[PDB]
């Protein structure tokens, strides 16, 4: 796969330097066949080929910015294991690759990213466990990677994460999510920490591991002093390490 | 009271069987004009019920009525006909339950009040802002703050309600109303408002210091040449007084608050509390003045000079605000302003203030006259905080070597010498070892944080721009 990834990066550099070559449907069939080969719809390609495929998807989205409705690009899968495979291989590398941040350069605008937000929540809630943690990771990376452009829609997804906490979906994955919330203090926690101290930390648990996680998040919360504004490339490294943990978790036979 | 609780339970049952009906919106759904025409009869019988209130609780349901009312409040955007009288009827319903409320759901009253602000159109937001500060918030700050020890919502969730208010409204009337009422009614609001300027979202960093600066008109540096006089703060509308059987109920604002329920109901034809003026209050101010607590007048000119007239401070701009209700009525019921270890998170707010000053950036000068006013560099500040401070101020020096030939850029490049230079001289005095430890290409993990470190590329061009900002740093003396 390494010279195949070299071929795909040759195609990617042709798209990078020559934007006008994106018109022929042969390139589009290359995009569709490399996406369906990365998805495999047990033998997965290595990280350079997957990086090349995701960068090809990233270029095709930025260039053809009027065509290509994302509902078949983030492809339809009626089976949920194919949906969590999409969350693992297709979604979160696209989130990590699209986040450059330079203010003079554009990126994915508002309607496609709110379609992504409703997509991840509709994976999470129905409008059984590793797919839910992967959905929390997708919510994790879209919250941290899109700080400046989700400036209109906080309260509705505040109600959705309220509904997530009301249903205990996933269990301890919710406690790790709210521990990240109260640790790095991303601005949704201002509408969430009164919900913590008034409902969640005020109503106790019943399972001893959930009690230990609850005391952990309570000691992290009750210290009202200065938090740590992290370097957050170590947050990217936690994303890669959790990706490698789940990658060896799904190719282990069970 | 025999058939009144029966008919309230019958309408509760009606909305329950229409709630177990999946909302397909089949017609006839009763319109909001018809819903408020029924509940106007309910408001009249609730007026005749709350004409005898003095714990005089009747056998009505107030717990399922809360969830029925918030589901109705979420059916407000699903309606078309009759929205204004629907809002008036919801207002009358909630304020007539306010004497007969249980103390388990009353703590979560005003957050659920502000939770339906974005669902309402802006023409109903004037009735929202003309009714809230009269009724909803004050009884939650009076009836529920006598029992402290429990986590109250003005400690925790006040920053949440105020962020939603800064987000969804664009009126200095609305923001000035909520800021004056929540500051005057409860203390230590400044720490949570600093905490929401600190860790709030980025779009509420302009207005939460803009509308603050009506009430906090001091963080301008001296010789205040200011061109950001956009939306000069004309205050809110003088409240039209509910007591119909008074004499001067046209134009004057209120100064005390009549909460005595039976007299208010049977005299004003309006729900309690009745907000009484200066001429209105002094009729029942002899025997029932334990209920009359001092309210303040809308001040369109809050002075940037100190509001106490016996001035003794050298700087006419006075920093610390204390807001007791002792003698704040010698100027026309005007909020009088005044003049240790809690500093570090305040400077953290400045770190998060100037972090998104990359791209009308007058907040840099607010951070300039913030850091040199009451932030002290000492040994109480830890190593990580000082490393973070010197790294973020170095990014501010480089980003103020940018922003060429704009008016606020000319202002921040005028105030860059002679103001932060004595601060860096004190830094070179006390902690020059940690600065040159932070001037190393890859420092400790307490130092190289924040900014644009999230890159899926080579980090050696970041070091090239680091050497470039050191090059821009050297001729600064």
Swiss-Prot record, chain A:
<comment type="similarity">
    <text>Belongs to the unc-80 family.</text>
</comment>
<feature type="transmembrane region" description="Helical">
    <location>
        <begin position="128"/>
        <end position="146"/>
    </location>
</feature>
<comment type="subunit">
    <text>NALCN complex consists of NALCN and auxiliary subunits, UNC79, UNC80 and NACL1. These auxiliary subunits are essential for the NALCN complex function. Interacts (via N-terminus half) with NALCN; this interaction facilitates NALCN surface localization. Interacts with UNC79. UNC80 bridges NALCN to UNC79.</text>
</comment>
<protein>
    <recommendedName>
        <fullName>Protein unc-80 homolog</fullName>
    </recommendedName>
</protein>
<feature type="transmembrane region" description="Helical">
    <location>
        <begin position="172"/>
        <end position="192"/>
    </location>
</feature>
<comment type="function">
    <text>Auxiliary subunit of the NALCN sodium channel complex, a voltage-gated ion channel responsible for the resting Na(+) permeability that controls neuronal excitability. Activated by neuropeptides substance P, neurotensin, and extracellular Ca(2+) that regulates neuronal excitability by controlling the sizes of NALCN-dependent sodium-leak current. UNC80 is essential for NALCN sensitivity to extracellular Ca(2+).</text>
</comment>
Curated annotation (Swiss-Prot), chain B:
<comment type="function">
    <text>Auxiliary subunit of the NALCN sodium channel complex, a voltage-gated ion channel responsible for the resting Na(+) permeability that controls neuronal excitability. Activated by neuropeptides substance P, neurotensin, and extracellular calcium that regulates neuronal excitability by controlling the sizes of NALCN-dependent sodium-leak current.</text>
</comment>
<comment type="similarity">
    <text>Belongs to the unc-79 family.</text>
</comment>
<comment type="subunit">
    <text>NALCN complex consists of NALCN and auxiliary subunits, UNC79, UNC80 and NACL1. These auxiliary subunits are essential for the NALCN channel function. UNC80 bridges NALCN to UNC79.</text>
</comment>
<protein>
    <recommendedName>
        <fullName>Protein unc-79 homolog</fullName>
    </recommendedName>
</protein>
